[PDB]
Every structure is written in C-alpha cells, then in structure tokens.
Amino acid sequence: SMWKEKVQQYEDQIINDLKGLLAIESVRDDAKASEDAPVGPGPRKALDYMYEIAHRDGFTTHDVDHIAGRIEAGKGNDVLGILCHVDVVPAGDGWDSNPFEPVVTEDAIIARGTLDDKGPTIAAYYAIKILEDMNVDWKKRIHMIIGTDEESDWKCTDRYFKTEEMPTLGFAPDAEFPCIHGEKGITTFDLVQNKLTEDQDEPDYELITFKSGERYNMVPDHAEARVLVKENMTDVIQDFEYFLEQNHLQGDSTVDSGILVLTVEGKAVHGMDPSIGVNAGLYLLKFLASLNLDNNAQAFVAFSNRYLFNSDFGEKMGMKFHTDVMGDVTTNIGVITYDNENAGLFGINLAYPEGFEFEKAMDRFANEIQQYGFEVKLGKVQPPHYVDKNDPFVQKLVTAYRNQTHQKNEYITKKQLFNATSIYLEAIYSLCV
Hints:
By secondary structure, the protein is α+β, with helices and mostly antiparallel strands. The chain has two domains: 1-181 and 386-433, Zn peptidases (Aminopeptidase, 3-Layer(aba) Sandwich), CATH 3.40.630.10; 182-385, no CATH class. It contains eleven helices and 18 strands. The chain has helices at residues 2-8, 11-22, 41-56, 118-133, 159-163, 234-246, 280-288, 295-308, 358-370, 392-403, 414-432; strands spanning 61-64, 68-74, 79-85, 103-104, 108-110, 141-147, 169-171, 185-193, 205-213, 222-229, 251-256, 259-265, 322-323, 327-328, 330-339, 343-352, 374-382, 411-413. An eight-stranded antiparallel β-sheet has the order 11-12-10-9-15-16-8-17, covered by helices on one side. The protein has a five-stranded mixed β-sheet with strand order 1-2-6-3-7. Strands 4-5-18 form a three-stranded antiparallel β-sheet. Helix 10 crosses helix 11 (414-432). It is elongated and about 95 Å long. GO terms for molecular function: acetylornithine deacetylase activity; dipeptidase activity; metallopeptidase activity; zinc ion binding. One of its GO terms (biological process) is L-arginine biosynthetic process.
C-alpha cells in the first residue's frame, strides 16, 4: 500500500539498526550477573542499545533496574503497549555462519535473534519512528516495553509492572497473561443469613417470602414481598404508594386473606454497571425497613440497607476502588431471596479492575459481617486479564495484516522484516493517530 513504500524509504536505516542489535551477544548469563546486569552483560547491552537509538531519534526512555524498560512516544491518556525482548538463546549446534556477526544477504539477514525477537523489535520501533518523522498528531501514548529476562512472562506481578504503568491496550505475542488492560475481573458470592429459631411477640408484619432477580449478573427489575399483616392494612398500602412515588417507581399492592403482596418494578441493565439501572429488590427492602417486622425479616432488611442499598460501587462493603482508566469496583446484587425456613440470601456480582485487592477486602468484610449472623459463600473468582483476540490493537494488526499479503542458522527475510514494519505501521497509525 502507501504504507509499504513509506517503509521502503527507511530500508537501510532499519537494516543498520537491526544489524547493530543482532551483533550483541545478548545471551543470558546468570553466573556473571550483577546488579548492573541482572541477567548478564549481553542483555544489558542490548537493552542499552535500544535506549541509544531512541535518544538518537529523540524519544524519552525509562529503565527499570536494568532488566526491562520502555521507549515512550505519543500523546494522550491511553497507552498502547508493544512488548518485546532483546535477550536471545545460545547459538550452539552447527551454524554455517557466525551467529552474533550478522550476515546480510541479497534477500535475507542471518543471525540469532533475527526471528525472536530482535527483528520484530526493530520493525515495531521503526513503525513508531516513521510515524514520528511525519510529525503526526498523536492521540495515544505508546510504550515499547522491552525485556531481557526470559524467566518472566510480563505479569502484573513481575518486575516491570510492580511499578510501571499498565498499557490500556496492546500486543504481547509470547505471553499468556501480560499485564495489559483487557477483561474486568469478576466474582460472585452469596451473603447468607443464619436462621434465628428463637421466640418473639407477634409482629405488626411478618415477611413470608421475598424474591427478586435470578442467578445472572443483571440488575433485577422485579421484586415481590408477601407479608402477613397483624392489624389493619390501609396504612401500609398508603405508605407503599407514597414510597413508590417518592422514589419514582412503578409498583403495586395486592391483598388477599391477610397476606399483603408488594410488587416493585425496576430497570434491568447489565450488572457490569449497575448505577445505570434500578434495583427493584433493594428498593423493596428499603421500604420494608420502615416497618415493624419479625426478627429475622428485620435483620435481613437491615442488612440490605447497611451494606447493599444505594451502593453500586462497593462503597458500603468497604470496597470502593477507583482506577484512572480501567474503571471502578462494581457491586451488583443480582438475586435476593427470603423465606421462613431458609431465611435470607443475597447474590453478589463484584467486578474489579486490576489491581484491587480482592481477597483482603473479602476477608475484612467476611468478618465485619459475623456479628450480624451473615456468612460469605464464595463463588467463582475470575481475575482481570487480557484477551488477545478482544484487543483493539491486536485486531488492527490482523486487519493491517490482511490488507497486506532456537533453530540453527536462524534468519529473517528482508521482505518479512519490512512488511512487519508496514503492518505495525498501519495498525499503529489507524489506532493512535
């Protein structure tokens, strides 16, 4: 395309830069490591080499303990990350050429690291340099993140991500769980009430059943309470209507034979953002809170009100947590049930960004709850993670690709190399410009 010519104007500089990087015997050497070169002198030089060309070309860089680092470009809130590495495996068995003296041929360039990774690392960097030469007007920051330690897999756990910013999206071809934003974390768990089989006076109201929602991460738009009314009913009915209008709610009340049936409609919406909908079940419990109920029903209504009502962002559970780009901890109450025999239950869906402290928070709350006769039953934990095929950059790469088109004696084709730059080039452009 136009992209392809563009690169062709940088052919010699790409080759030169590449040669320079292949010529470094950046092989792991644990026995000669130091604090200055934690995996040995080679990889350290290869990482330094990258910072030099970055500087030569005017990019800011940032080093992390001389094991990994980044070359920075672009402008804006979002950060696209491209993760690569400059360490290389040993050459070893029967090379027809010097593995760390690159030979550039007519069609091809021959050396260790041509394929993994030095070639793609250079392609990526040149896509960025080319775009920069255009003096193009960026809308995203780009972090070319460069590692040296084969032992790490780019986890939010590993040395770089302990302290450096997490890319909001990106490409990390060789890691299964890179620290890149992707999928919100998500769990479920039940809050279960301990039944209280004790003795008490007859109550103005006995809650017989309550049901709202189902076991989906949706905001329930329907709730029903069936209540035994000791004395008269005109007051409760009148108050329910008032409550419905004060809260701008559709709902309704039905009587038969001493049983009052209270019904509240809400607004279903996905549980991944509950603030947007209206939880019928929580609203109905909110109203029950004003009544003299039997003990168990009253503790159950009370619990909803202390921890649940009007707390879409985990606030009343001690779990508010805000992320600069990745969103907030979110709590949807998808299911609420109650009956005489089993007492009460609340099903919670809790969505979190990396890296909210999940189990620590649970434990704290798990205990706070003890005093109220409520326990936590843990559902499935699905931690935040990156999904390569959902990633908007990986996708532009596949599109850009479509638009265009440990061995011995490893080599890379000139054409493979320039094409790789064209495709990085197109994709990065479309996405950050």
